[PDB]
Amino acid sequence: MEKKTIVLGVIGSDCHAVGNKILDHAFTNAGFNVVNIGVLSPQENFIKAAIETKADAILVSSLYGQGEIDCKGLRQKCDEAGLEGILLYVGGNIVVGKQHWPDVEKRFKDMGYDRVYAPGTPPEVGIADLKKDLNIE
Amino acid sequence: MEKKTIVLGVIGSDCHAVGNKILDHAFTNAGFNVVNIGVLSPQENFIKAAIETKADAILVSSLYGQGEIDCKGLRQKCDEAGLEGILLYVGGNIVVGKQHWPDVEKRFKDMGYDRVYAPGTPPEVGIADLKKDLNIE
Amino acid sequence: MELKNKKWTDEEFHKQREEVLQQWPTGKEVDLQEAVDYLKKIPAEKNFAEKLVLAKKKGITMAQPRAGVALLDEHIELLRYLQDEGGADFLPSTIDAYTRQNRYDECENGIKESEKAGRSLLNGFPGVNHGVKGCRKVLEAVNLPLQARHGTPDSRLLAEIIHAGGWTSNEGGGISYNVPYAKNVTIEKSLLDWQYCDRLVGFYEEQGVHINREPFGPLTGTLVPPSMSNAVGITEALLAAEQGVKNITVGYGECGNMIQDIAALRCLEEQTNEYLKAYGYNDVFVTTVFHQWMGGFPQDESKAFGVIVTATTIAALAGATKVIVKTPHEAIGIPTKEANAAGIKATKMALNMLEGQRMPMSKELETEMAVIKAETKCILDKMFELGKGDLAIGTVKAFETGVMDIPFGPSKYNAGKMMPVRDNLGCVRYLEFGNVPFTEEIKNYNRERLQERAKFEGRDVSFQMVIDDIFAVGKGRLIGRPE
Amino acid sequence: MELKNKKWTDEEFHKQREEVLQQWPTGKEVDLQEAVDYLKKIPAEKNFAEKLVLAKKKGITMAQPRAGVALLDEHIELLRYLQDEGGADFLPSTIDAYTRQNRYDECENGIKESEKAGRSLLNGFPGVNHGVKGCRKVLEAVNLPLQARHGTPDSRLLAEIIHAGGWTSNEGGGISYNVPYAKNVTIEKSLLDWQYCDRLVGFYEEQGVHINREPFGPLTGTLVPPSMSNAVGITEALLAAEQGVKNITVGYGECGNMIQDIAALRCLEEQTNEYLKAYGYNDVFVTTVFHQWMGGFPQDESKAFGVIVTATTIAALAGATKVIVKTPHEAIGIPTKEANAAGIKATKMALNMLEGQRMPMSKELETEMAVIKAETKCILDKMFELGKGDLAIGTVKAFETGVMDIPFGPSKYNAGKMMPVRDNLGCVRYLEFGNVPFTEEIKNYNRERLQERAKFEGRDVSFQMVIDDIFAVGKGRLIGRPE
Ligand code: B12
Ligand code: B12
Ligand SMILES: CC[C@H]1O[C@@H](n2cnc3c(N)ncnc32)[C@H](O)[C@@H]1O
Ligand SMILES: CC[C@H]1O[C@@H](n2cnc3c(N)ncnc32)[C@H](O)[C@@H]1O
C-alpha cells in the first residue's frame, strides 16, 4: 500500500488504551503513518495533529460510551480549521449500551462521520475501508 | 369417616419415577389414600384401579412430553366405565417443549381434565386444589 | 437362552439375529455384509471410536448434546444446527420413548401427528421406524460421529438398525438401560438382550469395524452415590468386553461436590481398566464421559447456565473425555435448537477457558478416591461371590438381594432400600445402607460425614433431608438446607 | 504538601477538607458532625464493613455487580432491580467517567441530555453532582450496603460526598485509580490525594463509624501478572492503614488458570496480613475480592456465561469474600438491568452450587504460591529500598525506574517496559522483564514455563503471542493458540 497519514486517538474523558495500541500496530503494519495522540484526547488535539501532519484521515476511537456526547461537532471544527473533506472514522463502543445498530450508525453519520463502526470491529475492516476511501487498494 | 382415595400414576411409556414417589409421600401425608399404580401405566390401569378402590380422583402425571398423545380419551373411557364426574388432574411436563402455558392448559381441559398443572408445580398446590374440589378443606 | 458371562458363539448370535430382525419390517434393511462395507467407508472424522482415541491422545474434553425429533428432515436440520451453530464435537440421536418400549406402532402414529402439527409430538427420533435408510440419511447429512442415546431395555433391533445405519456408538447396558427405564423387565432378560447389543459390536470389531459402547453412568440421575454408580459401570464394561467390545466409554453423573466428582470419575476409569486387565481383556480402549447435573434444574435460564458451566468446570478438571450438555430449557421441556446450541456454546467456552487444566492431587482427593474404590470393591466382590465367579449371574442375584440397589429406580427388581443423602459439604453419602455389603468402617465414615450436616443444620439426618436435596438445585443451591 | 507515608495530622487534614469541599457547590452539603450521626443510624445490614465481617465469619462468597446511570430515580430503580430480581449481596454505584476526571460541568450537561433522551448518556452515576442529598436517597431506597465503584485519580470530593451520603465503602487507591485511569497525573499527586480518601475513612473510624476500602486489584484488566497486581494491592493496603483505615478488601483480577488464580488470591490475602502486622497495623480486618475476567469478552451471550460462571467457580474455590459480577453485555455496552440481573443470578447459582467447597492444597498450588510470594517480595523489597523505608516515596521511585510497571497502563508515569504473556497452561508470566527487580532464578522459571508454550505451538514466544492472548477470550478460548 502507498503511504498515507492518519491521526489516531481516544476521545474525551475515555482512558481505554489497549485497543489504541492494537490499532496503532495494525495500521502501521498496513503501511500507514500513524500519528497516535493517545487517550483522554479532546477534539482540538485531533485537529492540531491532523494540521501538523497533513493527515488524510482522523480515526476517533471511543470505548467508554460517552462518545455520543464527545463526538458532536468535530466535523464543523475540522471545516473551520481548513480540513474540509478530511475522512472522519469513529469506532469502538461508541454509545452507552447495546442499541439498534442502524440507529447508531445514522446518528453518527448525521454528526458528519464518514464511517461508523460497531463493537468488536477488526482493525482489518477499517484498513480495507481506508484503502478504498483513499483509492489505494 | 371419609378418607378420600386417589389413583396416582405416570401415563403411557413414561418411566420417570421420582416425582411419583414424592407425590405419593405428599398426598399420603395430607391424609389421602393413595393408590399408586406407578410408571408406564396405560389409561386402562388408571381406570381399573379407580373402579376397584372407588377412587374420588385420578391424578395423571406425565413428565416425558408424549402425554399430549397418551392423555387423550381418558375422560371418555372413564364415562364408559361408570366413573362419570370423577376428578381428573394432569400435571408434570405434559407437552413436548416449552410452550405458551395458557394454550397448553386449554388443550388438556378440552380433553376432559378438570385441572392441568405446569412444570415445577409443588405437590402442595395439587393437595390444596383437591381438598377444595372434594369439599374437605 | 441361559444367562452366563460367556461370549456367544457365532451360531448362537446368528440364530438370535434372525429372530430380532423380524420384529419390525425395517429389519429387512439390515444386511450385515453390506453394512460392514458401508461402515468401513465412513471417514475417521465421523467414526465415534476413532475420534474418542484422538480426544484421549490430545487430552481434550469433547462436548456432546442430546437431540431428537420425530421427522427425518427436521431431525437432520436440528443436528446440523447443533454441529454448525453449536459447535458440537459429537452428535447424538436421542431415541423417542415409544421406541424404547418397542412400541413402533405408537412411533408411527406419532410421526403422523407430528407431520400434521408441524412440530414433534415424539420426544425423540424413532430410529427403528425410520430404518437403516433413514439413519444413513442422518449420518450422510452431518460431519461428525453419530451415537444412539436412549434408554431401552430391549435394544436389539435398534442396535442392528443404527449400526447398519452408520452410527458408530450405542449407549446403554443391561443394568443402566433397565433399572432407570423399566418396571417389569427382569435383570436376567435385560442382561441377555444387552449381551446381544455387545455381541453385535463384537462381531463388527472382528471384521475390523470400530464401534464405541457407552454404559449409562447417571442411572436415575437422583443422588446416586459414586460407588454404586461406578459398580454398575465397571460391571457393564466387563460384560461388554466379554462379548468382544473393544472401545468403551464409562460414564458418571455429576453429584456436585467437585472433589467427590473428580474422585468418582478417576476411580471409575482406574478401576475399569484394572478390572478389565484382571479378567484378561487387554486390548480395550477406555474413555470417560461426565454428565452435567442430571437432577432437577432451576427454571430460570441464567441459573441454568450456572449449573451447566460449573458442571463443565468439574468435567474439565476431572480430565473427562466427553461431557454431555444440558440446556437452559431442562426444567421445562425438550430444548429448541437455539436453547441446545446455547448450552453447547457455554459448555465449549468453559472447556476452552480451561484448556489443559487438571485438578492436582491432594490429600482430600486421595482420601475420597480410597473411600470410593473401597466401597465399589465391596459391591463387586459380593457380586462375584454371589455368581460363583460369573458376574452376569452375580448381577441378577445382587439385585435380588439388594447388594446392588439404585436410588428411586422404577424397576420392581430394584430393592429400593438403600437411601442416599448429601453430607455437609454436598457429597452424596449413604443414609440407609439396606443390603449394600459395606464393612463397618465404610458405614461409619458415611455416618460421620452426615453427622456434620446434622450439627450444622440443627436437625437429625433424615428422609426429609433427602427430599430437600432432591429439590435443592431447582430451588437455587446444591444442598437442601432448612428454609 | 510533601509526600510521606505518615498519618496526616487532624489539622493538616482539616485544612485540606476546607479546600476540597469548595471544588463543587454540593460540597456545602457535607457536615462531618451530622454525617457521623447519619452513618451511625445505618442498620448493620446496610454497612459494608460489617457485612464483610459477617461474610468472612460464615465462609461465604458475596456477589456484587457494577451499575450506574445518569438520573437519580432511574439509578435507584436499577439498583432495586439488581437487589430484588438479581439477588445481589452488595450494591455498587458506578461513577461516570466525567466525574472521574473532575469535570462536573460535563456531568451536568450529561444529566440534562439524559433527561431529554429518556436514557443515560453518561456511563455512570454523577455522585458529586447529585450531592449528599442524592446519595442518601439511593441508600434509603435500597436494603443492602452501598459502595462507590469508579476510577478517579482525584477522588477527594467524591469521597466526602459519598461517605456523608451513607455509602460505607469506597473503592480505589493512589496507584490503581491512577495508572489504568489517567495519562498525566503524577504518582506523587495521586498518592497524596488517595491519602486524603484514606485519612477521611481514618477520621470516621476514630468516631466509631466503620467504612470499607477496596484497592482496585485488576488494574488494566489485561494480562496483569499476579505478583505485580499483588504488589500494588499490598502497597495500597499499607498506605491506607497508615492513614487509619481498619477494614480493607484487597482485590485480584482473574487470569484464568484456576491454580494460578487461587494461588494469587491466597498469596494476596496472606501477604497483606503479613505486611500489615510487620509494620504494626494490628487491628485491620482484611477480606478479598475476586473480579471475574476483566479482559475482552466474547459477544455471544452463551459464551459470556461460560466466562462468568467459570470465573465464579474459581472465586468460590479460592475462598474469596466477594466476587464482582460480569454480564452477557460486556462485549457490547453498559448492561441493561435485565442483563445485569442475569449475570448476578448465574454467579449466585454457581456460588450456591459450590457452598463451602474450597480448593484443597496440592504440590502444584504450593509451588505457584511460592513463586508468587517470591516475585512479590522482590518488588516490595525494592520499593522499600528506593524509599529508604518510606513505601510512599518508594512507590514514586519504583514507577520512575520501572520497578513497578503495569501492562498497558495509559499513564505516562508507567514505564511500559514489562510485557506479560501466557504459558502453555494459560498462566500469565513475564515475557519481558523490563526493570522489574527479579532474581535470575525467578526469571529462569518464567522463561522455562514460556518455552513449553513455544514447543507446543511451534513458534517462538513473542509479542504476537501477547496480541493473540489479548483477543483469545473474545474469540472463544483462554490461550491465544495459532489459528
Ligand atoms: C431425573 C430425570 C430423568 C431420569 C429419571 C429417572 C427415573 N426413572 O425417575 C432419567 C435420566 C432416567 C430420565 C430419562 C428420560 N427423560 Co428425564 N428428566 C429428569 C429431570 C432432570 C428431573 C425429573 C425429576 O425427578 N424431578 C424431581 C421430581 C420430584 O419432580 P418432577 O418429576 O418434576 O415432578 C414434580 C412436579 O412436576 C409435580 N408434578 C408432577 N406430576 C404431577 C401431577 C399432578 C396432578 C400434580 C398436581 C403435580 C405433578 O410434582 C412433582 C413432585 O414435586 C427432568 C428435567 C427437570 N425437571 O429438570 C427431565 C425430563 C422430565 N426428562 C425428559 C425426557 C424427555 C426424558 C426421556 C423420556 C427421554 C426420551 N426421549 O425418551 C427419558 C425417559 C424414558 C421414558 N421411557 O420415559 C424431559 C421431558 C421433555 C418434555 N416434556 O418436553 C425433561 C423435562 C427434560 C427436558 N427438558 O427435556 N430423566
Ligand atoms: C479492559 C477494559 C477496561 C480496563 C481498561 C484499561 C485501559 N486503560 O486500557 C479498565 C478496567 C481500567 C476499564 C475501565 C473502564 N471501563 Co472498560 N472495558 C474493558 C474491556 C473489558 C475490554 C477492552 C479492551 O481492551 N479490549 C481489547 C482491545 C484490543 O479491543 P477494543 O478496546 O474493543 O478495541 C478494538 C475494537 O473496538 C476496534 N476499534 C476500537 N476503536 C476503533 C475505531 C475504529 C475507527 C475502528 C475501525 C476500529 C476500532 O479495534 C480495536 C483493536 O482491536 C471492555 C469490554 C469488552 N470489550 O469486553 C470494557 C468497556 C470498554 N469498559 C467500559 C466502561 C464504561 C468503562 C469505564 C469508562 C467505567 C466508567 N463508568 O467510567 C472505565 C474507564 C474510565 C474512563 N475514564 O474512561 C464499557 C463501555 C460501555 C459502553 N460503551 O456502553 C465496556 C464496553 C464494558 C461494558 N460492557 O460496560 N475497562
Ligand atoms: C431427562 C432426559 C435428559 O435427556 C435430554 N433429552 C431427552 N430427549 C431429548 C431430545 N429429544 N432432545 C434434546 N434433549 C433430550 C433431556 O433434555 C434431559 O436432559
Ligand atoms: C470495563 C468496565 C467494567 O465495569 C463495568 N461498568 C462500568 N460502568 C458500568 C455501569 N455504569 N453499569 C454497569 N456496569 C458498568 C463494565 O460493564 C465493565 O465490566
Residue numbers in the entry:
A (entry chain A), B (entry chain C): 1 to 137
C (entry chain D), D (entry chain B): 1 to 483
Recite the paper's sentences.
We have set out to test this AdoCbl‐activation hypothesis with two “stretched” AdoCbl‐homologues, designed and synthesised as potential structural mimics of “activated” AdoCbl, provisionally named “homocoenzyme B12” (AdoMeCbl) and “bis‐homocoenzyme B12” (AdoEtCbl). AdoMeCbl and AdoEtCbl are bound in a base‐off/His‐on form, with distances between cobalt and the coordinating histidine imidazole of 2.21 Å and 2.17 Å, respectively, similar to GM‐bound AdoCbl (2.22 Å) and free AdoMeCbl (2.19 Å). In both new structures, the electron density for the “stretched” AdoCbl‐homologues indicated an intact bond between the cobalt ion and the terminal carbons C6′ or C7′ of the 5′‐methyl‐ or 5′‐ethyl‐adenosyl ligands of AdoMeCbl and AdoEtCbl, respectively. The refined Co−C bond lengths at 2.07 Å or 1.98 Å for the bound AdoMeCbl and AdoEtCbl, respectively, were somewhat longer or slightly shorter than the 2.00 Å observed in the crystal structures of AdoCbl and AdoMeCbl, [25a] but in stark contrast to distances of >3.2 Å observed between cobalt and C5′ of the adenosyl ligand in GM reconstituted with AdoCbl. The distances from Co to C5′ of the Ado moieties of the bound AdoMeCbl and AdoEtCbl were 3.2 Å and 4.2 Å, strikingly comparable to the distances between the Co‐atom and C5′ in the two observed structures of “activated” AdoCbl in the crystal structure of GM reconstituted with AdoCbl. In GM‐AdoMeCbl, the cobalt‐bound AdoMe‐ligand fills the adenosine binding cavity with little strain, and its Co−C bond remains intact. However, in GM‐AdoMeCbl, the corresponding ribose unit of AdoMeCbl exhibits a 2T3 (2,3‐twist) conformation, similar to the particular 2E (C2′‐endo) ra‐conf in GM‐AdoCbl. Hence, AdoMeCbl is bound to GM with not only an intact Co−C bond but also exhibits the typical hallmarks of a rather unstrained ribose moiety. The experimental geometric parameters reflect only a minor “pull” in the case of AdoMeCbl and an opposite small “squeeze” in AdoEtCbl.
We describe here the high‐resolution crystal structures of GM from Clostridium cochlearium, reconstituted with AdoMeCbl and AdoEtCbl and the pseudo‐substrate (S,S)‐tartrate. As previously observed, GM forms a hetero‐tetramer consisting of two copies of the larger ϵ‐subunit (an (αβ)8 TIM‐barrel) and the smaller B12‐binding σ‐subunit, showing a typical Rossman fold. The ϵ‐subunit harbours the substrate‐binding site comprising three arginine residues (the “arginine claw”) that undergo strong polar binding interactions with the carboxylate groups of an (S,S)‐tartrate ion. The process catalysed by GM [12a] assigns the enzyme‐generated Ado‐radical the specific function of abstracting (in the direction from (S)‐glutamate to (2S,3S)‐3‐methylaspartate) the pro‐S H‐atom from the 4‐position of (S)‐glutamate, furnishing 5′‐deoxyadenosine and a 4‐glutamyl radical.
